[PDB]
Amino acid sequence: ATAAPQDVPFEGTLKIDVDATDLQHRIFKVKTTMPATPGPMTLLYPQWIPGNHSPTGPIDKLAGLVIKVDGKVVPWTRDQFDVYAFKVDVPQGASELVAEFKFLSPQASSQGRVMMTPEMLNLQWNTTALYPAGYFARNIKAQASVTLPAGWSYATAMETERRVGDTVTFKPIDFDDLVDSPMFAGKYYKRVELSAGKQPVYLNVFADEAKSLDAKPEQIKAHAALVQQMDKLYGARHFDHYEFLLALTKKLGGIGLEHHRSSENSGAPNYFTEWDKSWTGRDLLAHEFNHSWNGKYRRGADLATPNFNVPMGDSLLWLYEGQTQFWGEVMSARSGLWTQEQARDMLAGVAAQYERGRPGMAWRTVQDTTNDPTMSMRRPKAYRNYQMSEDYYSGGQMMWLEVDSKLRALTNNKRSIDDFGKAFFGMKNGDWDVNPYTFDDIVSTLNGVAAFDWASFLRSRMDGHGSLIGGIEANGWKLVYNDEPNLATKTDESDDKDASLTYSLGMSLKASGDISDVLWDGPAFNAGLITGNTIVAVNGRAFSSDVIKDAITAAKGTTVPIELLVKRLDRYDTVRIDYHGGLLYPHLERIAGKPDRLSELYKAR
Amino acid sequence: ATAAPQDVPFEGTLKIDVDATDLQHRIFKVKTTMPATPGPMTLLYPQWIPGNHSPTGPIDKLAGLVIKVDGKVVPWTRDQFDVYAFKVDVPQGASELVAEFKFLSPQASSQGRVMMTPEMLNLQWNTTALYPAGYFARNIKAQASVTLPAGWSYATAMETERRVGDTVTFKPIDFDDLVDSPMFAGKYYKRVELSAGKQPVYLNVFADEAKSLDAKPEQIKAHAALVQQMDKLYGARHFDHYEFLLALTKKLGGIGLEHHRSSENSGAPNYFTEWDKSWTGRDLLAHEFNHSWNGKYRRGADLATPNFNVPMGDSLLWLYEGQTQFWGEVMSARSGLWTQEQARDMLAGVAAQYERGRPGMAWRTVQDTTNDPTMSMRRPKAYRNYQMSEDYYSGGQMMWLEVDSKLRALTNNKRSIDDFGKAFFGMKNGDWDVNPYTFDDIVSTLNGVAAFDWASFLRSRMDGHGSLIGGIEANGWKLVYNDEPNLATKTDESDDKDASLTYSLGMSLKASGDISDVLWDGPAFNAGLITGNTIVAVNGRAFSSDVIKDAITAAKGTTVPIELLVKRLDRYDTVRIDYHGGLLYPHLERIAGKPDRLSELYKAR
Ligand SMILES: CC(C)C[C@H](NC(=O)[C@@H](O)[C@H](N)Cc1ccccc1)C(=O)O
Ligand SMILES: CC(C)C[C@H](NC(=O)[C@@H](O)[C@H](N)Cc1ccccc1)C(=O)O
Ligand SMILES: [Zn+2]
Ligand SMILES: [Zn+2]
């Protein structure tokens, strides 16, 4: 076992030098230099990574580790009860320890998200760092450098000291901020100012091909409007400057990861060039940006750990991620990243997910899903709808919508969730240290906006099994289903011609006919169907998405079952599904006579 | 978080009832009943599973959990710092707790190994169990039952009380032995006696199709000879009876998992029907059977944990798995499961793997690979040859071969590793409780066979970076390479037309030309190639395994480089490989002047 980290000074500087030039093998070469204290010394590879809420440190990708003290090799021994901890014996009279190793980043998605391509790379300093055990991470002064592919541009919130040729030397920085200061680099780069002033915000775009960088003025303006709308909500910025990192790519592994003064984001090459086709993911930058307030600056006390190698407590992720999921979609509408119609159909899809798409809510609480990061590490699960899957995101969002609606009702619409945002995250402009909070702090700040038993309200939703969608009705709308496609579903289905049929047949299909998801206790489930089975034919006709949708519509209101020819492994059988509700996709409709608070919430300030 | 398990009596019986009939959804339905006193109670889902040496308990597949005390639901709360631990409050006057849940076994291999098919199933009791925290697992008396698909046969070492219809009630058993008593069930079943007597051994075969069960007399005899050869080695059996469980299948997930009185094994449907083609995997039953002595009965003290929810120490896996890997191959030859020529070429491949196929030994020791189970959980890695990958298996095997050769050299061939086997595992016939050992015990028993500094010998090999293949030459043979295919490689290549070129071009390829492996610092590596790249053409000719092999031979002894057309993502380039050694496959050849101890080692006793 590794001794607990202590809030004591670390003498000297942890030097971290990274060679990021072996794009072909996708290898980051690392040298870490630090003072050596005589006696046993334990070095740690970061395990629990802020923003991942789970022990995602890729320990088995650390290879070629050789440790030398004052130029002599010393053998290392891994702690079999802490496989992220390497112990060496430092001789008496020693001065300096050097550890050299390689981070073997994924050569295919099966190994994790790809971090190197022929045109760009993603350096996450936790993957290229060893640091001494026994210290709070913030007490370790670090100084990093990286050697880039020839002539590549780079971007990071971390301040550059100098670039000599292709070796970038950064100014000293605390080790926790180093891990929190990722770098993108690439040959096709555009830097766009989103906000000038004393706390400026920039957008750093890297692409597989330069043509993807052609952001149009109104599209840049929508990102600039995001910054303005966050200013209206919070009244403060928790950074001295902010660097959006955005990779437009089909080669780099997808990412959305927040930091204090930056975020790592990926989109498709058509993020800008096909604005109307790429909209469903455009809440990404709003989401990760919001975390600078909600998650990085303010963090649950059980989540704000002293180093990267003690476990994180995720109990409050329904605020961290849940309210950020909420604000990401709201701010997308307020900024023009989304249209109001797009944002409303997205919210309808969230509401339907918890009204009808989450039968696991009968036995599992949203609170318990804050354990999903460590339980599952986002590995494949058979029934996201019944096992549940990180619903502290979207279920949390629905609770925060209801919180907004209740604040309005208590105050005759003079207060809203905007007032909680300013009160809870708006203090101490410019500070980007960690300001921890507890559950009781959430309650007290809500009670300060409008007096109410908020503790019971939050517990009843997060520890309950009942409806989470009450914020829809209270804010003047109603969740409905009809045969009109949901804007998000339609965009997500089309071009590949897939078929999302969650609320009719209780399954989703690829264009090939392969079932990609099955709703627990739904019609497909009750025919014994599982993901991976194939719908070969519908009423005798070779499967297509149009064919099965037409058959569903033809069965609406009749008593003639839909006949599905199914391939299960190497067997074929025909099932008859007595489903006659037609195609059903969620939308929101106004409740006439009630105030439309929802549109006010989603309106630009 | 969770209180430590104590060696104190457990009052009552843990009843575990499993319904294994939902083959379509692949769901095991579970009811666990246990004594309960009022107040706080913590229930555990097994986490660290004996024989996996890592926390493989599938916690995220436990769904639908409802806990009732005296018929009334009690809410449960998971420990966010121990996600395998469930906490409830037991009301006053209660005597009994009932927990019901479902184990959602993998619906595809991406979720883990498949455990249900239309013809067979594999029940592992740890996946269908909750048990009270605070107790040594061996102190908990359990009693299990299972409801099978209609008419299915079953086999397990656990003794049956009665079968009523399709519900099997088992006799009470200690909870640790329950977890150690898996069950196979299926519609195509054959039971074969391998040894009669007071400690009988049976082979239980389940198949996708009945024709695969047609074991011929000489093939059954080889399995009977395996039991006889183990008797000669150890002189004792650590079980009152033993049940081989063997699944001949393309649908059940592959498995080799040892137990005290049974093992879980899978083979191809042609395990018997194409005996000469399916030979490379036939050390499986010899391997897992050997674990009844080495691993189950004798186990490292740091591995022999008190329950399933504290971490296991794997430091001695180079004995547990390493010597079992050794005996699995030796016993295949001694029993006739393998021919002597097959076993020799298999050993040649192991020797070559550490002579030339493990460049990672320059920085990592075999000892450190005992941490790979927890580090990697057998997830994909880019360079098994450089990161290393559980080399305590085959590297351990090579060390034990050298131990054998050294015992012979010290004793003028009067003692061998067979004497260590009998001395270390041959005590206490009939005993199948765990008999722990430490490193010092290994040393003392070796020293008792022949006096020598065995501690330094073992450490020099397991903590070193040098050669592990010294036992080959010491026992009278020499590792050589030539263009004659290795029998194991040829069989593993055949039918699919793959190309293993580790010792020539430093890579392996599928018939498609996709690179499946790259040797660190080898020729393919030095051309920048990675797994997933595709060799499109060789000297301009469309790739095939024969085409690239012919080109390698054509380049032998010349100065004309091999031209490879390569697809890297969406780009094509041609590389010139200056490799002129020809095809090189490992074999063993006699050193004519030296005594042939290797053949003695592999000879039937
Ligand atoms: C591309 C998007 C879907 C990315 C999105 N990212 C986020 O929500 C971030 O704010 C999360 N902090 C990223 C995260 C959370 C838990 C475990 C691993 C990674 C996510 O769901 O991971
Ligand atoms: C089919 C064969 C390859 C199976 C073989 N099984 C064994 O060696 C058993 O003795 C191991 N005890 C199985 C094992 C070890 C570590 C982690 C998971 C599972 C294995 O390598 O897993
Ligand atoms: Zn987030
Ligand atoms: Zn084994």
Side-chain angles (χ1 to χ4, degrees):
Chain A
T2 299
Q6 303 296 130
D7 192 353
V8 297
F10 178 80
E11 296 296 325
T13 299
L14 174 62
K15 284 182 55 69
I16 293 173
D17 302 313
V18 178
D19 180 313
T21 60
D22 188 358
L23 304 171
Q24 287 178 107
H25 303 128
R26 310 195 194 167
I27 292 176
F28 297 77
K29 186 171 176 187
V30 187
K31 177 179 189 173
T32 68
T33 304
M34 69 200 76
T37 310
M41 199 168 171
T42 295
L43 308 180
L44 298 174
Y45 194 68
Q47 173 187 30
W48 294 78
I49 308 303
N52 286 333
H53 321 312
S54 52
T56 54
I59 183 61
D60 77 354
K61 293 174 174 58
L62 191 171
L65 176 62
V66 176
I67 300 175
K68 296 176 173 179
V69 173
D70 292 346
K72 311 306 294 182
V73 173
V74 293
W76 52 265
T77 303
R78 189 188 312 258
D79 191 334
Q80 72 176 348
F81 294 110
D82 183 2
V83 298
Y84 290 76
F86 304 83
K87 185 175 67 61
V88 297
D89 290 303
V90 176
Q92 295 296 320
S95 297
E96 181 175 82
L97 179 148
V98 179
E100 292 193 54
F101 63 94
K102 294 166 197 208
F103 169 56
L104 312 183
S105 73
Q107 298 187 334
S109 298
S110 62
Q111 295 164 15
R113 57 173 295 274
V114 171
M115 307 178 80
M116 278 178 160
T117 88
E119 294 85 31
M120 67 175 67
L121 66 82
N122 176 192
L123 172 53
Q124 299 181 329
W125 298 97
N126 60 284
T127 67
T128 59
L130 289 169
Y131 70 105
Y135 303 90
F136 278 32
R138 71 192 181 203
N139 296 351
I140 301 171
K141 188 66 67 180
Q143 180 169 26
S145 75
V146 60
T147 300
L148 301 167
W152 280 22
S153 301
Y154 71 97
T156 173
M158 180 164 48
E159 291 88 341
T160 293
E161 177 176 296
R162 65 196 296 241
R163 177 176 184 160
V164 180
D166 297 307
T167 296
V168 180
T169 300
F170 298 100
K171 291 187 173 174
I173 197 173
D174 292 342
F175 180 59
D176 57 336
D177 285 328
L178 172 60
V179 170
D180 197 58
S181 299
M183 181 189 72
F184 283 15
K187 61 174 66 178
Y188 302 128
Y189 170 62
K190 178 177 283 179
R191 179 173 178 82
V192 177
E193 176 184 280
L194 297 185
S195 170
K198 299 308 185 60
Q199 296 163 268
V201 182
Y202 298 93
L203 173 60
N204 303 278
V205 193
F206 303 78
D208 293 352
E209 303 181 275
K211 68 187 183 183
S212 302
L213 306 172
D214 186 26
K216 301 305 192 184
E218 68 273 15
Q219 302 166 346
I220 293 171
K221 189 170 291 293
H223 293 77
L226 169 61
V227 181
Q228 296 166 345
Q229 293 298 308
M230 290 297 191
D231 283 336
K232 293 282 207 297
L233 168 58
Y234 293 116
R237 296 176 183 186
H238 289 291
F239 49 79
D240 55 355
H241 71 285
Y242 190 95
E243 303 281 344
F244 281 101
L245 310 175
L246 176 57
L248 305 188
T249 181
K250 294 180 178 90
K251 305 180 187 178
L252 200 75
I255 184 164
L257 186 55
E258 69 276 15
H259 304 283
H260 279 286
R261 311 184 294 169
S262 60
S263 52
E264 299 165 88
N265 308 271
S266 65
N270 71 351
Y271 184 99
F272 295 113
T273 56
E274 298 189 290
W275 184 263
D276 294 332
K277 300 174 68 78
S278 58
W279 71 268
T280 60
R282 266 207 301 277
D283 66 316
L284 178 58
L285 269 64
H287 181 109
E288 309 303 349
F289 191 45
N290 190 75
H291 279 313
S292 183
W293 293 262
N294 178 20
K296 301 308 301 178
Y297 178 64
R298 304 234 59 189
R299 194 175 316 164
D302 52 332
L303 189 62
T305 45
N307 73 3
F308 306 100
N309 291 77
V310 300
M312 289 166 172
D314 293 347
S315 70
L316 293 173
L317 284 187
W318 45 260
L319 174 54
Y320 190 125
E321 296 290 349
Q323 197 183 103
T324 291
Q325 188 68 22
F326 171 88
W327 283 120
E329 299 198 349
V330 166
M331 286 297 174
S332 291
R334 290 192 187 176
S335 66
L337 292 167
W338 284 354
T339 71
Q340 295 291 336
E341 299 76 15
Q342 284 168 345
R344 202 162 44 237
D345 253 12
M346 189 88 24
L347 180 58
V350 180
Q353 176 164 300
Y354 293 94
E355 191 197 55
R356 296 180 192 189
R358 284 293 182 271
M361 198 108 113
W363 70 273
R364 197 184 185 196
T365 66
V366 175
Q367 178 64 78
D368 187 58
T369 71
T370 67
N371 299 304
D372 278 341
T374 300
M375 285 168 62
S376 293
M377 306 285 286
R378 304 204 160 166
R379 293 183 294 265
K381 58 175 53 164
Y383 301 95
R384 282 170 304 171
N385 58 84
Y386 188 72
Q387 290 152 281
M388 309 288 283
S389 187
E390 291 174 25
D391 299 82
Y392 58 84
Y393 274 87
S394 302
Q397 168 185 13
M398 295 308 297
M399 181 184 66
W400 291 115
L401 175 64
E402 193 175 5
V403 167
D404 173 77
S405 74
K406 184 66 171 179
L407 287 163
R408 297 178 191 272
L410 292 164
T411 64
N412 193 227
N413 203 37
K414 290 185 184 181
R415 303 290 184 263
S416 69
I417 195 171
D418 282 64
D419 298 286
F420 175 86
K422 180 166 287 176
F424 200 77
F425 310 96
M427 68 283 285
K428 289 165 178 168
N429 174 64
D431 284 4
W432 44 289
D433 63 336
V434 175
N435 183 347
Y437 63 81
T438 66
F439 176 84
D440 290 348
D441 294 330
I442 305 173
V443 171
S444 69
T445 298
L446 282 169
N447 193 73
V449 178
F452 188 68
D453 184 3
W454 290 107
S456 295
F457 179 89
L458 295 171
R459 287 190 170 104
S460 74
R461 303 292 187 263
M462 293 296 91
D463 298 333
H465 304 286
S467 172
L468 297 176
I469 68 167
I472 297 284
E473 176 178 337
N475 275 347
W477 294 69
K478 178 179 185 61
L479 170 63
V480 301
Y481 304 76
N482 57 44
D483 62 8
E484 182 68 29
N486 179 281
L487 290 176
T489 308
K490 184 185 183 156
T491 297
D492 286 353
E493 272 181 348
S494 294
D495 291 340
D496 290 355
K497 293 179 171 290
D498 301 328
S500 167
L501 307 172
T502 308
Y503 308 113
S504 55
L505 293 187
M507 57 172 164
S508 299
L509 303 92
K510 299 308 244 293
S512 65
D514 292 335
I515 302 172
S516 61
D517 195 33
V518 179
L519 175 67
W520 186 274
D521 282 342
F525 181 92
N526 290 338
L529 299 181
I530 63 169
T531 298
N533 297 161
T534 303
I535 302 303
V536 180
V538 184
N539 298 330
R541 178 164 185 180
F543 172 90
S544 77
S545 293
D546 290 337
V547 161
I548 193 167
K549 289 176 179 172
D550 288 342
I552 291 164
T553 297
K556 185 176 180 177
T558 76
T559 57
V560 179
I562 302 164
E563 299 219 322
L564 300 182
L565 178 64
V566 184
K567 191 175 189 290
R568 312 174 199 239
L569 296 182
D570 63 350
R571 305 292 309 204
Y572 292 81
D573 72 303
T574 288
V575 299
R576 299 163 75 255
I577 303 194
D578 213 58
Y579 173 74
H580 307 287
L583 298 169
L584 291 174
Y585 308 109
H587 307 279
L588 302 187
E589 281 180 4
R590 274 281 287 144
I591 301 172
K594 290 185 74 152
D596 182 1
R597 305 306 185 205
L598 190 67
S599 295
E600 296 183 36
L601 172 64
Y602 276 72
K603 188 181 179 184
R605 290 180 61 181
Chain B
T2 298
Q6 304 300 342
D7 193 354
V8 298
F10 180 82
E11 299 296 324
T13 300
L14 174 61
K15 288 182 60 70
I16 293 172
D17 301 312
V18 176
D19 180 311
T21 61
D22 187 359
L23 302 170
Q24 288 178 109
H25 303 128
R26 310 196 193 167
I27 293 176
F28 298 77
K29 292 187 276 301
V30 187
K31 177 182 72 171
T32 66
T33 304
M34 67 200 77
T37 59
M41 197 170 171
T42 296
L43 310 181
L44 299 174
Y45 193 67
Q47 174 187 31
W48 294 76
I49 308 302
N52 288 149
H53 322 311
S54 51
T56 53
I59 185 62
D60 76 353
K61 293 174 175 58
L62 190 170
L65 176 62
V66 177
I67 301 175
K68 297 177 174 179
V69 172
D70 295 20
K72 301 179 176 188
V73 173
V74 293
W76 53 267
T77 302
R78 190 188 313 259
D79 192 333
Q80 72 175 347
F81 294 111
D82 184 2
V83 299
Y84 290 78
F86 303 84
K87 301 151 150 291
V88 299
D89 290 304
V90 178
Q92 291 295 320
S95 60
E96 182 174 83
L97 180 148
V98 179
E100 291 192 53
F101 61 93
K102 296 169 196 94
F103 169 54
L104 312 183
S105 72
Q107 298 185 334
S109 292
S110 62
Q111 296 165 16
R113 56 173 295 275
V114 172
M115 307 178 79
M116 279 178 162
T117 88
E119 293 85 32
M120 67 175 67
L121 68 84
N122 176 193
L123 170 52
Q124 300 182 328
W125 299 98
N126 58 283
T127 68
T128 59
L130 290 169
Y131 69 107
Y135 303 91
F136 278 33
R138 73 192 183 202
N139 296 350
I140 302 171
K141 190 67 68 180
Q143 188 214 269
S145 76
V146 62
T147 301
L148 299 168
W152 280 23
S153 301
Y154 72 98
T156 172
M158 181 165 49
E159 177 169 29
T160 293
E161 175 59 40
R162 67 192 171 267
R163 178 175 185 160
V164 180
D166 297 309
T167 297
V168 179
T169 300
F170 297 100
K171 291 188 172 174
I173 196 173
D174 293 341
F175 178 59
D176 59 338
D177 283 325
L178 171 60
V179 170
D180 197 58
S181 300
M183 182 190 72
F184 282 14
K187 61 175 67 177
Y188 302 129
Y189 170 63
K190 178 176 283 179
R191 178 174 177 82
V192 178
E193 175 183 280
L194 298 185
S195 170
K198 301 247 183 54
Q199 296 162 269
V201 180
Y202 299 88
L203 173 60
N204 301 279
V205 192
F206 303 79
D208 294 353
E209 303 180 272
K211 68 187 183 182
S212 302
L213 305 171
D214 186 26
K216 300 305 192 184
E218 69 273 16
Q219 302 166 345
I220 292 172
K221 186 173 232 300
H223 293 76
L226 167 61
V227 180
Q228 297 166 345
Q229 293 299 308
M230 290 297 190
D231 285 338
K232 294 282 206 297
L233 167 59
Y234 294 120
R237 296 176 184 187
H238 289 291
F239 49 79
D240 55 355
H241 72 286
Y242 190 95
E243 303 281 343
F244 282 103
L245 309 175
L246 175 57
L248 306 187
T249 181
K250 296 291 188 183
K251 305 180 187 178
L252 200 75
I255 184 164
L257 186 54
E258 68 277 15
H259 303 283
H260 280 288
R261 310 185 293 168
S262 59
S263 50
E264 298 165 89
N265 308 271
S266 65
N270 71 351
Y271 182 97
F272 294 115
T273 56
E274 298 187 289
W275 183 263
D276 293 333
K277 296 178 66 76
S278 58
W279 70 268
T280 61
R282 266 208 301 278
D283 65 316
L284 180 58
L285 269 64
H287 180 110
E288 309 302 347
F289 191 46
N290 189 75
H291 277 313
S292 183
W293 292 262
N294 178 19
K296 300 307 301 179
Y297 180 66
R298 305 297 323 260
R299 196 176 317 163
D302 53 331
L303 189 62
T305 45
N307 74 3
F308 306 103
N309 291 76
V310 299
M312 289 167 173
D314 291 347
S315 68
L316 292 172
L317 285 187
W318 45 259
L319 174 52
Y320 190 126
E321 297 289 349
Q323 197 183 103
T324 291
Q325 187 67 21
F326 169 93
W327 284 120
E329 300 199 350
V330 167
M331 285 296 175
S332 291
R334 290 192 186 175
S335 67
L337 291 167
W338 284 353
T339 71
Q340 295 291 336
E341 298 79 2
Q342 284 168 344
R344 201 171 298 116
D345 253 12
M346 279 289 334
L347 182 57
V350 180
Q353 176 164 299
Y354 292 93
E355 193 196 54
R356 295 179 192 187
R358 284 292 181 272
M361 292 261 296
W363 70 273
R364 196 183 185 195
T365 67
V366 173
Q367 177 65 78
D368 186 58
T369 71
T370 67
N371 301 306
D372 278 340
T374 300
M375 285 168 61
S376 293
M377 306 285 286
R378 305 205 160 166
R379 292 183 294 267
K381 60 175 53 164
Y383 300 94
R384 283 170 304 172
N385 59 85
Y386 188 71
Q387 290 151 282
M388 310 288 282
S389 188
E390 293 178 64
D391 299 83
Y392 58 84
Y393 275 88
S394 302
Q397 169 186 14
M398 294 308 298
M399 181 183 66
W400 291 115
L401 175 65
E402 192 175 3
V403 167
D404 173 77
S405 75
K406 174 62 72 165
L407 288 163
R408 297 179 191 272
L410 293 163
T411 63
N412 193 24
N413 203 37
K414 292 178 183 178
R415 303 291 182 264
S416 69
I417 195 171
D418 282 63
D419 298 288
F420 174 87
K422 180 167 287 177
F424 200 77
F425 310 94
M427 69 283 287
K428 286 166 176 48
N429 174 64
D431 187 7
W432 46 289
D433 287 320
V434 56
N435 183 345
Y437 63 81
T438 66
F439 176 86
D440 289 348
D441 297 329
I442 306 172
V443 170
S444 57
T445 299
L446 282 169
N447 193 72
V449 179
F452 187 69
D453 183 3
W454 290 108
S456 296
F457 178 89
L458 296 171
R459 296 302 191 192
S460 72
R461 303 291 186 261
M462 293 297 91
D463 295 334
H465 305 286
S467 172
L468 298 172
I469 67 166
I472 298 283
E473 286 212 15
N475 276 349
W477 294 69
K478 180 179 187 62
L479 170 63
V480 302
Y481 304 75
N482 58 44
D483 61 8
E484 181 69 29
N486 179 282
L487 290 176
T489 307
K490 182 43 71 185
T491 296
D492 285 351
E493 271 181 348
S494 74
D495 295 340
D496 292 354
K497 302 176 174 71
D498 299 327
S500 167
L501 306 172
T502 307
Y503 309 113
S504 54
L505 293 186
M507 58 170 164
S508 300
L509 304 93
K510 301 308 216 192
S512 65
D514 291 335
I515 302 173
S516 61
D517 194 33
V518 179
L519 175 67
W520 187 275
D521 282 342
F525 182 94
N526 291 338
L529 300 182
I530 63 170
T531 299
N533 295 162
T534 305
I535 301 304
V536 180
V538 183
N539 297 329
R541 179 164 184 182
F543 172 89
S544 79
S545 293
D546 289 337
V547 161
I548 194 166
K549 289 175 179 172
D550 287 341
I552 292 165
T553 296
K556 185 177 180 177
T558 78
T559 58
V560 179
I562 301 164
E563 298 217 322
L564 301 182
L565 177 63
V566 184
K567 189 176 188 179
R568 311 174 198 239
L569 294 183
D570 62 349
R571 307 298 178 108
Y572 294 80
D573 71 303
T574 288
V575 298
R576 297 161 72 75
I577 306 287
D578 302 301
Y579 175 74
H580 307 287
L583 299 168
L584 291 174
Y585 306 109
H587 306 280
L588 302 188
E589 281 180 4
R590 275 280 287 143
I591 302 172
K594 292 182 75 151
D596 181 2
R597 305 311 186 201
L598 188 67
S599 295
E600 295 181 34
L601 173 65
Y602 277 73
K603 191 181 182 298
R605 290 181 61 182

